[PDB]
Amino acid sequence: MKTIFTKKQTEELLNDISIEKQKELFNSMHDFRSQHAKEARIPGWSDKYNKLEKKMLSDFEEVTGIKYDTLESELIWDNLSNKFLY
Ligand SMILES: [Zn+2]
Secondary structure, three states: OOOOOOOOOOOOOOOOOOOOHHHHHHHHHHHHEEEEHHOOOOOOOOHHHHHHHHHHHHHHHHHOOOOOOHHHHHHHHHHHHOOOOO
């Protein structure tokens, strides 16, 4: 679904935020997404999962200044994962 910012706006933001801050956000997204993959198809959400989720949300807001939402986060993830290698 359409995101709160355009695709072009999101690209241009990621041409402005520093590479080190982008990498920070990539790593916290990567850690969350990996844990989500382990728990996606089974009951419950572990305390570890919740901890990683909360970290990701906090880093998202710190690095981007954008109120967290799942769709704009996805669009940012796709851009970050294209650039960075865990
Ligand atoms: Zn689950």
